[PDB]
């Protein structure tokens, strides 16, 4: 790749011939427009500091008036929902687990973290070079019991989304719930019903989904143990 | 952090409302100036394909003629070298392991990339945010840091580089001391044939004195690869 002169010298360094300069690109970003003004500026630097390959970089915010804005990494192929959606019938299930893999990865430095993201989906989730997932903004087809029915949230309540996150992903984007009510999602959920098996996702897959759907929260597997077990599927594939 | 207006709006792509925007940021680089211009250009791609946290980033060429120059990760601490001098009876052990870590992960990416520095001393690293050391000056075409076939027959492996690591760990761990410091050519290349060693520095422990005599066995085959001193010296540091 060559620069053309978007570069400006400073002083010497080196001593063959080094300088410090300046290097003003152009780099490709995603704008979110939008009380408290102190308190956004510290808010932005403890997300600034949740820092993951898998997950979206806030690079700052804007506060000078007029429509204020939060600065994040563009992530050139938009949300995994309409990714999955558009591409329909030409994923491989390897692909499909890479995804999960990628979403899992991230959601583990938030569950190390100690962060709840509160709302994980497809819809959440970004695909950025070559097909890289990672996780973004930080609503009852994605919550737990002890979520839609008492706002118990916790990584475990985090865990029963990214079952449905992967279901999303192995139906190559299709709707969880398709035609179901709030309170029809809530008595299918406590009557026992669990989202279909798709065919791109195997046995052991659909028994991962499973374990995430779990009644209580404790009995569910943390990302910790999630990440090994996907990692693993991915590699001895 | 805070940014003002160095931002420039293009689209909208969100609908809160999202657009695709371009952001204009001061980076600091590190200009070095200087064979056809086709030649340059590919071999400037092929050392920006060698991409790794603890290796210095090519992030491109300039060819607008006047003096042609070449645009790096800039490293505000300056090279290892300088570094240690100027921070000389400040340093744990910990520390100066900590930079042989550093640039034992580079140089393992590097030998499984199969490509060989042929020049590894702590004058080539450079020190950055929070004393990250990372290799510099190896894709950019003595005797003291040259293993006994680079001194005889001139053969250059990444067991050779081996050997120079062997001596740039000498270098870290003695807080920038000159190797061989009052030795000519011809004594370093005798000495070495005879089977004597650069002595222990004080900060270095005995495990870690090991490590750099395996570094400096007479025989390519005998000294051990990037990724085997990388296990041990990750080892070492995740314990002691
Ligand atoms: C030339 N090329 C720039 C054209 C082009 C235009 C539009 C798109 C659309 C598909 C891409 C897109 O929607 N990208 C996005 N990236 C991000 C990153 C972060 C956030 C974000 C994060 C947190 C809160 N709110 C928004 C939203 C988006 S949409 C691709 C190429
Ligand atoms: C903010 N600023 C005004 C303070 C400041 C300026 C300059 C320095 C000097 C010490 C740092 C320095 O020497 N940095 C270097 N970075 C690089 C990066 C690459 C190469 C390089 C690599 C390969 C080939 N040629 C050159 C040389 C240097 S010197 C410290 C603070």
Redesign the pocket.
Known sequence: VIDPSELTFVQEIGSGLVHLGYWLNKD???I?TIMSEEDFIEEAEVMMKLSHPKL?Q?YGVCLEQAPIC?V????????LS?YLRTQRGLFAAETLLGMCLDVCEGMAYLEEACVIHRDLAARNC?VGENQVIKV??FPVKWASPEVFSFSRYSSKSDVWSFGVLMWEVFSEGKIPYENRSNSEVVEDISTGFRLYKPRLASTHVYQIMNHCWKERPEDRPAFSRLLRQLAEIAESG
Do not use: N
């Open positions: 490709k970003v995603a979110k979206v806030l939060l994040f990494e563009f992530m050139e192929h938009g949300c309409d970004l973004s903004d």
